[PDB]
Design a protein around this ligand. Structure first.
Ligand SMILES: N[C@@H](CCC(=O)N[C@@H](CS)C(=O)NCC(=O)O)C(=O)O
Ligand SMILES: N[C@@H](CCC(=O)N[C@@H](CS)C(=O)NCC(=O)O)C(=O)O
Ligand SMILES: N[C@@H](CCC(=O)N[C@@H](CS)C(=O)NCC(=O)O)C(=O)O
Ligand SMILES: N[C@@H](CCC(=O)N[C@@H](CS)C(=O)NCC(=O)O)C(=O)O
Ligand SMILES: [Cl-]
Ligand SMILES: [Cl-]
Lengths: 227, 227
């Protein structure tokens, strides 16, 4: 470790996966993942209040200045590996543990398909609802932006609600990385963002059903508070 | 084929990959991909003007009511496979052709990492610039939303510009699915969306360099017009 990132977050456990994150919907995706697959890891809180995500040290593992990011001392070829983007980390950790993602077949690509649905739709659009309802955008007088993203959030929820009808999880019977990527965001929309009534969350009983099942998993319960 | 989608888009070539798309940044990702890897396919134009993406036939392969989507008659286990989400289709077609994505190692996960950067950042945020500069959002008097997404587009471009410094493509020497996912959007931002001056695109010479190289690839040139 002659690496820059460890100058701010030194590894007490320099053999385990290093986690640079914060209990946000995108961050808990990865901590939940690690808890679910039983891989040993060390967690470091990246504080936004002190702008830790803008430091050159953090930028060396995540040039996008965003959490989560990992640094696996024992990546492929037992060489160290840095990664950012929650979805990429999910796929990586799935491959490495052989868990929560089918090895091939139609099911693998359908799982990635729903993961992309979250990455390009759920995450970014719910994020906009948060800006316009919880943060600086709350004060904008023209409420058409808020309505645009509430309506998009409703459309996405309905797509997911229709899909979950008759299924235990997103991929039917098997719990997968798709669930791990999706439900922390639904949780955040109706909790921290206070948009539950706004998007009419009770109108999506299937989404609520699976969310309820998600947060009752002990691994999930741990991961939600980490770090 | 007792499938619903083929009731509106019947396959002249019922042995080749079926492409339901439209020359949009997300659509050309997949047509460019298919042209680059030399896989035979058939293209069907999904017209938004007639709301073809809302028909039950389209929804059976893409429940999110969005293009691109494919239907591969000969997917895994020589069973038919439907997929939506451009990024998922890119990874699928990469695996199937053994092209444009490393089989493993650090490079594979770093490629997916940059693909996720596009999926969750570039695509959704440039899309918002288009709404507020080209479409209905253009007329909103409060210009703070437009500025929010222009500024985010600038931040993303700078992340990418810093990264491309000294590299031939996103993954350095090798042209990958990351380039195929990213540059159709940069092209669209400064072409169709007319936001080139708005985001100050000349300030990102590396991005412009690689974009120039991208659109001079013949496969890319074909794919941009398809269907
Ligand atoms: N597409 C990215 C999004 C990551 C992201 O948005 N992280 C937020 C917290 S949930 C962040 O780090 N914000 C810090 C900043 O933008 O300054 C991913 O899935 O990892
Ligand atoms: N401060 C920036 C970043 C705030 C931020 O990163 N929010 C996260 C949620 S905590 C987000 O929207 N991520 C979008 C995604 O995951 O795609 C902003 O105003 O957008
Ligand atoms: N995350 C999706 C985004 C797909 C997407 O946004 N498609 C647009 C065209 S580029 C669309 O089909 N719009 C139709 C609609 O929303 O009604 C992907 O990458 O495939
Ligand atoms: N009409 C819808 C959909 C329009 C649409 O699908 N735009 C595409 C570009 S043509 C987009 O923004 N895709 C976002 C992405 O790829 O993540 C809207 O106003 O957002
Ligand atoms: Cl599915
Ligand atoms: Cl990299």
């Amino acid at each position: 470790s002659a690496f820059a990132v460890t100058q701010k977050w030194p590894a007490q456990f320099p053999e385990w996966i290093q986690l640079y994150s914060l209990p946000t919907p995108n961050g808990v995706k990865v901590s939940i993942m690690l808890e679910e697959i039983g891989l040993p890891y060390e967690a470091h809180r990246v504080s936004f209040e002190t702008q830790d995500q803008m430091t050159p040290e953090f930028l060396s593992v995540s040039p996008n200045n965003k959490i989560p990011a990992i640094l696996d001392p024992h990546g492929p070829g037992d060489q160290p590996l840095a990664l950012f983007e929650s979805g990429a980390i999910l796929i990586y950790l799935a491959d490495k543990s052989g868990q929560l993602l089918a090895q091939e077949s139609a099911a693998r690509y359908e799982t990635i398909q729903w993961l992309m649905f979250q990455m390009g739709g759920i995450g970014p659009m719910f994020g906009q609802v948060g800006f316009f309802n919880k943060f600086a955008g709350r004060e904008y007088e023209d409420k058409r932006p808020l309505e645009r993203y509430v309506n998009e959030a409703k459309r996405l929820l309905g797509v997911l609600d229709k899909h979950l009808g008759g299924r235990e999880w997103i991929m039917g019977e098997r719990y997968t990385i798709a669930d791990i990527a999706t439900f922390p965001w639904i949780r955040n929309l109706i909790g921290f963002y206070e948009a539950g009534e706004l998007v009419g969350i009770d109108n999506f009983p299937e989404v609520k059903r699976v969310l309820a099942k998600f947060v009752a998993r002990p691994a999930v319960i741990r991961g939600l508070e980490i770090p």
